[PDB]
Every structure is written in C-alpha cells, then in structure tokens.
Amino acid sequence: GFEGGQMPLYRRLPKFGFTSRKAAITAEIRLSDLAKVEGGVVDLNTLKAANIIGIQIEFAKVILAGEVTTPVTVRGLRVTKGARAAIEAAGGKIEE
Amino acid sequence: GIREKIKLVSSAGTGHFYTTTKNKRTKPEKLELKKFDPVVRQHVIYKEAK
Amino acid sequence: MTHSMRL
Amino acid sequence: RNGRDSEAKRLGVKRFGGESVLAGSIIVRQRGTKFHAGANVGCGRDHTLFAKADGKVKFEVKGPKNRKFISIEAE
Amino acid sequence: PKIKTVRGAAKRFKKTGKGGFKHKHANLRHILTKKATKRKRHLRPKAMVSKGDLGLVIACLPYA
RNA sequence: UUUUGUAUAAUGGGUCAGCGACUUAUAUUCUGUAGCAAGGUUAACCGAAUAGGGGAGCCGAAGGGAAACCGAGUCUUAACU
RNA sequence: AGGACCGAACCGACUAAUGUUGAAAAAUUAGCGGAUGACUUGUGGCUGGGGGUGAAAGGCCAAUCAAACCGGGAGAUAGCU
RNA sequence: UGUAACGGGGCUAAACCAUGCACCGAAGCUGCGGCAGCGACGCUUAUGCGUUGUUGGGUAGGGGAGCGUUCUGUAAGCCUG
RNA sequence: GUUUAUUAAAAACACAGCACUGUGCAAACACGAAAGUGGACGUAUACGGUGUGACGCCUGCCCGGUGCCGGAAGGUUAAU
RNA sequence: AAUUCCUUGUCGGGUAAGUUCCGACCUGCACGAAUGGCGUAAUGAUGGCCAGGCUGUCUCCACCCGAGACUCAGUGAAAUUGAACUCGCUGUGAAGAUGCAGUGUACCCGCGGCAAGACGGAAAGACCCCGUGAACCUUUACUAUAGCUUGACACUGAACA
RNA sequence: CUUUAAUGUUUGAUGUUCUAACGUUGACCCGUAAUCCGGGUUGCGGACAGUGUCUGGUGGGUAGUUUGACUGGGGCGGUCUCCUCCUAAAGAGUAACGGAGGAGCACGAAGGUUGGCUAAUCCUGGUCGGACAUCAGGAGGUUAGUGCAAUGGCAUAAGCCAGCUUGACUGCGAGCGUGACGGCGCGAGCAGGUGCGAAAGCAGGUCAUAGUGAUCCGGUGGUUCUGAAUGGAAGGGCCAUC
Numbered sequence A: 001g002f003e004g005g006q007m008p009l010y011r012r013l014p015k016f017g018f019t020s021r022k023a024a025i026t027a028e029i030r031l032s033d034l035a036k037v038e039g040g041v042v043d044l045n046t047l048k049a050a051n052i053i054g055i056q057i058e059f060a061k062v063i064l065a066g067e068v069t070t071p072v073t074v075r076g077l078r079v080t081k082g083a084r085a086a087i088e089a090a091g092g093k094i095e096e
Numbered sequence B: 001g002i003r004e005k006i007k008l009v010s011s012a013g014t015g016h017f018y019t020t021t022k023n024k025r026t027k028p029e030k031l032e033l034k035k036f037d038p039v040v041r042q043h044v045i046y047k048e049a050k
Numbered sequence C: 001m002t003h004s005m006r007l
Numbered sequence D: 001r002n003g004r005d006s007e008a009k010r011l012g013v014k015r016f017g018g019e020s021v022l023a024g025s026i027i028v029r030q031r032g033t034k035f036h037a038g039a040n041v042g043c044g045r046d047h048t049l050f051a052k053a054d055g056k057v058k059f060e061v062k063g064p065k066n067r068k069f070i071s072i073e074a075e
Numbered sequence E: 001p002k003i004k005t006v007r008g009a010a011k012r013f014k015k016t017g018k019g020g021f022k023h024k025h026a027n028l029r030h031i032l033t034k035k036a037t038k039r040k041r042h043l044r045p046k047a048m049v050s051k052g053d054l055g056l057v058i059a060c061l062p063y064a
Numbered sequence F: 001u002u003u004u005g006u007a008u009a010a011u012g013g014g015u016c017a018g019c020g021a022c023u024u025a026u027a028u029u030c031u032g033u034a035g036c037a038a039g040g041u042u043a044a045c046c047g048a049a050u051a052g053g054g055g056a057g058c059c060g061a062a063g064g065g066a067a068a069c070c071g072a073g074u075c076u077u078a079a080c081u
Numbered sequence G: 001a002g003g004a005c006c007g008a009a010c011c012g013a014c015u016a017a018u019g020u021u022g023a024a025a026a027a028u029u030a031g032c033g034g035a036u037g038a039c040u041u042g043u044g045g046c047u048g049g050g051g052g053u054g055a056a057a058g059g060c061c062a063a064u065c066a067a068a069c070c071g072g073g074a075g076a077u078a079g080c081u
Numbered sequence H: 001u002g003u004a005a006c007g008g009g010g011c012u013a014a015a016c017c018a019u020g021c022a023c024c025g026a027a028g029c030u031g032c033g034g035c036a037g038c039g040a041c042g043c044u045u046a047u048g049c050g051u052u053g054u055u056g057g058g059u060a061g062g063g064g065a066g067c068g069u070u071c072u073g074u075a076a077g078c079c080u081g
Numbered sequence I: 001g002u003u004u005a006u007u008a009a010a011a012a013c014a015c016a017g018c019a020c021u022g023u024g025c026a027a028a029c030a031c032g033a034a035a036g037u038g039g040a041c042g043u044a045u046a047c048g049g050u051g052u053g054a055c056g057c058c059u060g061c062c063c064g065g066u067g068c069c070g071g072a073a074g075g076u077u078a079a080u
Numbered sequence J: 001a002a003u004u005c006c007u008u009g010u011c012g013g014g015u016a017a018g019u020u021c022c023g024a025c026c027u028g029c030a031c032g033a034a035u036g037g038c039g040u041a042a043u044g045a046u047g048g049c050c051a052g053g054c055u056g057u058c059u060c061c062a063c064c065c066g067a068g069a070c071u072c073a074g075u076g077a078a079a080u081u082g083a084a085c086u087c088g089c090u091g092u093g094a095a096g097a098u099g100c101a102g103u104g105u106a107c108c109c110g111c112g113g114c115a116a117g118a119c120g121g122a123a124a125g126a127c128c129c130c131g132u133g134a135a136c137c138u139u140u141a142c143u144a145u146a147g148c149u150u151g152a153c154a155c156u157g158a159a160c161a
Numbered sequence K: 001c002u003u004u005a006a007u008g009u010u011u012g013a014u015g016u017u018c019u020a021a022c023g024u025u026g027a028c029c030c031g032u033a034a035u036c037c038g039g040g041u042u043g044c045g046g047a048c049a050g051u052g053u054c055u056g057g058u059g060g061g062u063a064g065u066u067u068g069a070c071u072g073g074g075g076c077g078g079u080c081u082c083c084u085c086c087u088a089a090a091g092a093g094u095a096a097c098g099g100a101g102g103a104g105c106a107c108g109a110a111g112g113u114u115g116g117c118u119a120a121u122c123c124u125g126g127u128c129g130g131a132c133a134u135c136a137g138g139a140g141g142u143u144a145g146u147g148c149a150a151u152g153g154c155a156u157a158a159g160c161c162a163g164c165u166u167g168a169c170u171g172c173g174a175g176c177g178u179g180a181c182g183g184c185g186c187g188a189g190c191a192g193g194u195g196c197g198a199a200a201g202c203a204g205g206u207c208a209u210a211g212u213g214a215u216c217c218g219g220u221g222g223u224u225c226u227g228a229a230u231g232g233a234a235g236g237g238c239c240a241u242c
C-alpha cells in the first residue's frame, strides 16, 4: 500500500461502521441441510449434533435456498417468508 | 472571512437545523427564513443561533 | 597538502 | 514575476453533427453562450448545453444575429 | 507465519458479492457548510473501489 | 559494465585451476494437473505406524446493511417510476 | 648568587641536503637550541573510553584517536556502486 | 606539427547544365535447398499427416521446449582386471 | 620555558604581576547512585573559578538587551 | 597599521631605478583602552628591510678527488599487466587515436642515455554535488534529562502566645 | 444583603520556649595493640537540617534528533495551491527560473419570481454652476454595465428599477463530461412540501470560470442502532455539524 509518499488509499478514506458481537453467534442454515439432521425435529441441539452450525451459535435463520421435501418441525428458529412457505408446503409444522 | 458561522434552528419539532454565514458589522438582524424541515415535513420558522 | 589536488 | 497558469478545463464541443445521443448527454461545454439551446436542448447553470431528448445533434444559424443553435431530432 | 492484515484497510473497506470492495466517500467529515447539499447528498452512499485501487487494496486485505 | 551514445584515452580483469550469487520455511492469490464433487478436507494426537482412526476445525453452497434485522432479496428514503 | 653566560655528556629538533619499492613505517650527514633547572633519567606505582591526561595542538592514551582495542548484538542498514 | 577545405593519384574533362541508353551496386527482391512458428482446408482426430498462405533483427522484459552435472529408486539388475 | 610523537616551534600556550567573583570550614568546588576521598592535616595575607599578562603612563562614557545581585507590595502560578 | 577595500593613497628618506622598508599626513571601507590602549631596556633556531665583510649563489661554468651508474663473475627483487605482429601526419570519432580513413615513411634485434606521449603507475577524488548518509561541535532549534532550586506529605514531638 | 461583638465548634499561619525523634566530620571511656566503626556518658544544635515520594522553576551540564524540493552546478535570490489570457501548431491536452494579470471573498440581498425600463461619450440651451453635479433636446448605438482579474458571453437582456418573497428546500436521480486515483462538474425527470405569477411557467443560490484542503483525533446536537451475566448507562455506530 505504499504509493510513493502520496497518502495511501486506505489512509485517505474514512473508516466507517463498527463490529457487532451478535453476528458471530448467528448462523443461517439453508433448507438443503434440513434433511441432514437426525430425527425429524430441528432445534439448536440437533443442529449442533448434526454439525450444521457449531457450538457457539445461539441463533439461526432457516432461509430459502431449496430442496426441502420431508415434514420437519422447527422449534425456536426464526424462519423467513419463502422458507416457511416451502416448509409448510412440504407439510411439517413451522413453529411450536 | 468576516462572515461568522451561525446555525438556524427549527421552531416546531427541533430535531433539525441548517447552517449559514452572517456578517455582524453590517447585519445584526435575525434570519427568520421560512425553510423546509425534513422531520416535521413542513415549512417552519427557523431562528439564528451560534 | 593541496598542491597536487584540484581544489 | 510570472509563472502561474490554471489547469485547462476541457471545454469544447463534445458531440458533433449527426451523432446519436441519449437524453442527458453533454453536447457543448463552454463559458458564455457561443452556442444557444434549441429544440430538445437545455442550458445548464454554467452554460453547458445538454440533450433533453435522445436523437441526432444538429447545428444551425438562426435569428437576426446569425447565432449558433443546437437542435436534436428525436430518432 | 501467516500474513497479517493491514488493519486500517479492514476499517476502510468491506468485501461484496462479486469480490469488489466498498468504501465510504472522503469529503464529508468537517467544514460541510460551504459544500452544496448536492455534493453532500452524492457523497453519502458507499461507493465501489476502482481497478488500480483494487490491485493495491487486494494486497492489503489478503483474507477478506 | 554503465550509458542518449564507447575502439574509446570511462570501469574491470596478469594467467590458470578450484570455490563464488534468486535459497528455505510458513501463510495467501493465480495457472497447470490429479482426486472427489454441493461437497471437499483433516490438525494435533492415538496407532508399531508414510496403513487405519481422529471431522475439533476450515473453505464453499446467499446476500444486503454501520448495525439491529431482513433474506433472493436487501439498503437509502415518509415511499421510490 | 643566578629558571646568569660560553660550551661536552645528556635532552631536544631550527635550516639545508640526501633518502622517499629507505639502512630506517620519522633516519643520516653538516651546521642548530637548552645544558643547576619550570632540568633530565632509571625502577615501581596511580588515572581509562563520552573516560583519562593535557604550560591547550582536538594533542596523547601500545606504528590506531572530533571518541582506543577486543568480542558480542550482527548476515545493523545501504532508494548506492 | 605536415600538403591538409576532391579520400588520394590525377583531371581542362575525369568539372558543371540538359537529354538518353547501358552497366556496376545491399544480408532488398527472385532462383534452388533446408529448418521452425502461426492460421485456414482436408484425411480418422497414435491430437497426427498432407495442402495452401504467411511469418522468422532484437535490449529490458513475458511465454514455451530442452541439454548436462551430483545424489535416490528401478538396481543383489547390467557393464567391467 | 611549553606545544601539534610522524609536514606547522610561532606572534600560539604558560608565566610572575593585576582585577573581579565565590568560599566562615562538615567551606566553596571536584570524583563518587552512596559511603567516602581531594581541597587540606590548610582555614580569608587561605582556597577555587574567570579574564588579562613583566615594568612605565594609564584604563574614558553607556545598565536600554542579556547574565548576575538585592527587594518583593501587587498580578499570574504546581503538587495538595 | 599582523587592521586600509579603493591602492603601488600622497609627501619625504634610502636605490641608477623601491608594490616591500623607514618617517609622516589622517579619507580609521572596518583602531581603541584588562576579549586591554600606547610605549619600552633586555631576550628570541621570531617577521620585514638596509649595510660592511665574505664568497661558484650568479655572470658561466671548468677541472680534480672519492661513492654509485658502465663491463665481468656470484646471488637475486618490486610496483605494473585484456591480448598484441605497440610508426608520423591530417581528418574522423563518447568531441585530444600506436590500432579508424586517406597518406607518408620504415631491413630484423640489442646496449647506453633522455623523458614529450602511452589522458603512464600509485590511492572506489580529500574540491563540487547527491544520500529523506554518518560523526562530532554550537545555540535564545525541538524533545528530554543529571544537577541545582521551590513547596506539600513522611521520618516529626510538647507547651504557650 | 451589611458592620462589628461575647461564647463555644475546627484548622491554618507566625514567633518564642522545651527535649525525647534526628544530626554531630565536639570531648571522654571501652571493644582495642586501631584518627575505621559500634556502644556508653556528656556538650552543642534541634523538630530545624537532611533523606524518600509528589511537584513548579531552571538546566547544551548531557543525550537523542531535525534543519524541504525545484534550480542551464550548488549556495543567495525567487517559487511551491487555485483562476484568466498567450505560448498551444483552427477537437481535447501540451514544457521552461517563458510573457502578463488576479484569488484565499462578498451578498437575506447583490438569491427567486412578476412587472417595467435601456447605455457610453459629445453638441446645443439654461440661476449660482465653472472642463465635469441638476434640467431639456439632439447625435451615437452598447465605444456602456456586470460586487472583484482576464476571457467567453449578455437586448428575449445575464444590465437598471420597483412589488412580493425564502427554492441559499428535503430524499433521490436516467444520463453524460473530466481525472491514474482520491475526487470534481453538468443534469432532465420523480416523491414530499413551498415562493412568485391571472396562467403557460420559473426557482433545489448568484452571467460562467478563482474564494480552497484528505485522513486520523476529538467537540456539540439528534436517533435504543449496538451496548461484554441481566436492566440501564458509559463508550462506540449512523445522521447533521465544528
């Protein structure tokens, strides 16, 4: 990043924003790994036992990528619009 | 140069102000200047301040 | 000793 | 005592006769009005002439003072 | 060892979807009241990084 | 060799023989090639052991935003043709 | 008597010449100055490196001094050849 | 410093002007022989063979293809009093 | 008289003398993280520092600047 | 004038002739009174100038005596060196040629001499410039700091006014 | 609020006195054959001195460093950013220690709109009044004027005057122009809310081009956007701004 004594580009521009600490403990999952979990129930515990998220993860979204076919029951996970559409069209209950 | 920086502060719903320049030795008179406010979305009376 | 030197 | 000159500010005719422009394109940058605005051409605050419609550029002489005008034909 | 990140570059730039970098514009910190509001309105969104700039930026941000 | 330019009266070398200068480690990006492929791969360690375990982790499959959050959309904006 | 005078040993080093890959990394030859003193010399001690010592020239401190030598940081660094 | 202001000898044309025809004259162009790169067009693609065209001065530099030296396997093989 | 050992011996340095200034003695000052040594087993006719440089005739005016000495009423001013 | 630029100031003395010397005059560019002023006997391997004597310093060199140099025998270096079959001139040329062009001259090889050239040898120019070099030194450059100095608290207590 | 006054509630300051801390490089005795030291008497000082921590001053005594570049060699001088003209070779751009001039602002009107108007300089006539003030007419036609240098412009005025005003408004912005980039400039149209005008319309500063500095660091205001167990808050972020 040395420009010849000209003030460099990363020092000519203003730094901006901050880093949130809740973004490390959140992992979105797609529907394609929703069949990968053991059993038919999807919560934080089985998503960690099926290696989908990780140990430090506390929150999850189950956003629409695709490929869901089985009835699943999602517990305590936030679901988006199109994801809950595809999940309820697959058959299983979205939240209880 | 001789124009001092002053601001002009909203009257109704003051979460907003503009900033301008004013010469003190010619004009000690006030601005009132009915400008637009984006917070209350109307044209309000504004007032001179530091 | 500045005699041979081009000074 | 001399030795100062400003940076040249790139004035002139950008789009010539017959050229296809889109609306909003700059045709002439200038200081005064060497060229005056005509049909489908607007005059900016620094006397920039710009395309207010998309067509072809045309130069004319008009009026009782033989002045240059820039028109645009909506093609 | 592993490469260190230039941390001021990590405070200035952010990675995007197609691999480009986004940054804040640089005139909007102080004496703004002589700047016209069109200038300050146009300097407000985050821009993208140009390509020789992109070459000098990719070296300073080797990980992200 | 250095130069715009050297037979240059610019540098260097008396000659021979021997030795003498782009390396290694670790990360990262690109290219070639091989394996597997929406998957790929293990590290330390165990193991009589370049076998086999070990998936802790890492990268990829989703992004937008400073962030909360939303999510094939998202941000700006009172809301955007 | 005398930091008296002339003048050997002794101490020094003013001029010239020679030597300058020397007889000698500071001399020789011929003249020259002091020579009872603020003299010279032997033997032994003491002062040490930003320190010593200096009738002071940045002089001397082991043929080295506007900061000795040795060893270690150390393959300092060298946009220079 | 030595003629020394056609390169020289020498020239009253071997000088100058015009017109023309010959000829000499380069690593240019053609002829013949050979090698290599790139691109088209076919044979059945041992990713080759052929036909055509064109290219082939090179510093810094970029790209591609090789030769040779020492050591390891093949190799208790093979060569060698 | 001394001096650049090894290109400069001089007009340089020293000197006797002069003046200013510090120092009352557990002296000032110096070398010492300190103890302690030198000054000095001396004490103002002594010791240190600075300048000048035998002897003769003499050393004129300026205290604005800077340094030193004395005052400290008033302004400003630290830790607390 | 150890000081004076203009300058060899001007006048005088010394000389046949004196930018130095001596005495003056003051126009002191830019003397000056203890960073002392002006004298001064004696002293000085001290600076300048004049005179007498003396002479190879010189006019202008000559000869002689010894030590080398020269030859013979013995021993036996060194600096330097791209390779050499290593001429003059005039031109050209990275701009001053043994080496190029044109031209002239020149049998091969020593020995003693002399130094015009080989931009001769010697020492990565010491002058000049440059390096975001280095070292020392200076100071009312910056930032510190030893020392000196001030006050508070501690060692540190008791009475009074 | 004010002027002293007794009484207690508490410190401070100053001076004197005392000795028991501390000092003694005073005398004497012992360890001890000892001018070291320690201990014991005693004298002299005495809560001073001195030392530790904190602190103001002073401090080339010492240390670490800095002391720009261009430059017909360097130093001395001059310059360094921005605007206008020429060089500049009829697109743009284009160097010199080339030739000439300016800027580091002003203005709530000198901005917006509506309505209206049109110069300079001479000649004649007329109280003071005269080369030049005011008047009236004629000529002339933009040689004038532009808040400020030069150029380009300007009559439909961009010049001059009057009424009403705050668009010198917020969020954007198709598209272009110009830069290596950071950046800089022009912009029709759309949403909201206004001003002038009867209306078409015009207005998001000024006839245009100079009037300007990046980032970091902090100051102020608003917005739960985050907020280290939780609830706040601090501190960050974002927006406006210094």
Ligand SMILES: CC[C@H]1OC(=O)[C@H](C)[C@@H](O[C@H]2C[C@@](C)(OC)[C@@H](O)[C@H](C)O2)[C@H](C)[C@@H](O[C@@H]2O[C@H](C)C[C@H](N(C)C)[C@H]2O)[C@](C)(O)C[C@@H](C)C(=O)[C@H](C)[C@@H](O)[C@]1(C)O
Pocket: C001, C002, C003, C004, C005, C006, G020, J122, J123
């Ligand atoms: C005993 C014999 C010594 O030489 C001399 O005394 C002569 C008399 C010097 O001149 C002496 C005396 C004198 C006055 O020159 C005569 C003086 O100017 C020089 C600086 O030193 C010489 C030659 C100097 O050269 C000159 O140096 C000049 C910088 C540049 C000059 N060149 C341009 C031509 C060059 O020849 C110089 C540097 O000493 C040469 C270097 C190699 C030496 O040091 C060598 C070892 C010599 O000391 C020596 C040979 O032992």
